[PDB]
Amino acid sequence: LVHVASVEKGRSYEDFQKVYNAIALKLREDDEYDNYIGYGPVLVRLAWHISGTWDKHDNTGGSYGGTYRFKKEFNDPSNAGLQNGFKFLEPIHKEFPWISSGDLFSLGGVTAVQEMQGPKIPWRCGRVDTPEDTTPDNGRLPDADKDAGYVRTFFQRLNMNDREVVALMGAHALGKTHLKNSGYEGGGANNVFTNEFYLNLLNEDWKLEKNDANNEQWDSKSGYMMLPTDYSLIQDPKYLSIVKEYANDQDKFFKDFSKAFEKLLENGITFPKDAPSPFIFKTLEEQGL
Numbered sequence: 001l002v003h004v005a006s007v008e009k010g011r012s013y014e015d016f017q018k019v020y021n022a023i024a025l026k027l028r029e030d031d032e033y034d035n036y037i038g039y040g041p042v043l044v045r046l047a048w049h050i051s052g053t054w055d056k057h058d059n060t061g062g063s064y065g066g067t068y069r070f071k072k073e074f075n076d077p078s079n080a081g082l083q084n085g086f087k088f089l090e091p092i093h094k095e096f097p098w099i100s101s102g103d104l105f106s107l108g109g110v111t112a113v114q115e116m117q118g119p120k121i122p123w124r125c126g127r128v129d130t131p132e133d134t135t136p137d138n139g140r141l142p143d144a145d146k147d148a149g150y151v152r153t154f155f156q157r158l159n160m161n162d163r164e165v166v167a168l169m170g171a172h173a174l175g176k177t178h179l180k181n182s183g184y185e186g187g188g189a190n191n192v193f194t195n196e197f198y199l200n201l202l203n204e205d206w207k208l209e210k211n212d213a214n215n216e217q218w219d220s221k222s223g224y225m226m227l228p229t230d231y232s233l234i235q236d237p238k239y240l241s242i243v244k245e246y247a248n249d250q251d252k253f254f255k256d257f258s259k260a261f262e263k264l265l266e267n268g269i270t271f272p273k274d275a276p277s278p279f280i281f282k283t284l285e286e287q288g289l
């Protein structure tokens with residue numbers, strides 16, 4: 001099973017920078033969503049969930065086919081709340097109907113991270129929409145009620161090692177949980193990409209509490225929360241070392257996150273040797289827009 005990247009006919013960097021700019025301007029303008037967090041975090045989550053279905057064993061799932069547009073995947077209980085991100089992107093797809101679905105969903109994540117003052121994430125085009133029968137079954141995305149061993153084992157399916165896992169989890173500096181989506185009660189939230197997830201894990205006095213959906217989560221008197229899978233990163237000695245590293249080196253975190261997130265978004269895709277190089281998009285701020 002091979003998925004070969006194929007550049008949307010005649011398109012080049014300038015075309016994709018236009019799409020980036022459209023997403024970025026809408027992020028700036030539709031700022032009220034989710035109590036003024038805006039759409040950045042949900043777009044990051046969307047890009048991760050469309051990629052996180054991948055299975056290295058058989059090359060099924062992943063971002064290539066844009067299969068989230070089909071009912072089976074759209075309605076996965078693990079994807080509750082992502083409809084908001086899909087709705088955000090729909091008008092942009094109408095404006096740029098030539099872009100593939102997987103390219104749009106992945107580019108939305110890239111755009112969001114950069115516009116939230118995160119690292120630059122190189123991005124490659126050429127995902128191709130695949131038919132409804134290529135849609136992975138539900139249940140490939142991870143549960144939040146588990147321990148470090150679960151996290152480690154889960155991420156082996158995505159060909160991610162312990163450093164890649166800890167870097168990726170730093171995206172939990174962004175946004176929040178919502179009881180109605182996931183059964184976890186949200187805490188303090190931000191929409192600026194920093195290494196604060198790691199600082200909070202190490203510095204707060206966490207208490208194991210039960211929420212109104214009868215799930216356990218870790219809460220602090222400061223008003224922050226951690227999922228069990230978040231907290232696992234300080235219970236496991238290998239993960240803890242890496243958490244400390246990123247707490248103490250913002251730049252290292254940014255660089256490691258950039259590499260792991262690009263990898264996540266490209267898993268399963270074969271890029272021909274004459275494919276274009278990855279694009280690095282300018283932010284609105286860099287363009288004076």
Ligand code: HEM
Pocket residue numbers: 041042044045048080081142143144145151168169171172174175176177178179181182183184227229261
């Ligand atoms: C073991 C792995 C993971 C688990 C169990 C997990 C679990 C969750 C849960 C339960 C939520 C709350 C959903 C809601 O209630 O709206 C969430 C939100 C989020 N996750 Fe994860 N996550 C994991 C890994 C990741 C990774 C790898 C990324 C990206 C690189 C990511 C990015 C996010 C973002 C940005 C949000 C916030 C969305 C919002 O504010 O609407 N997560 N995650």
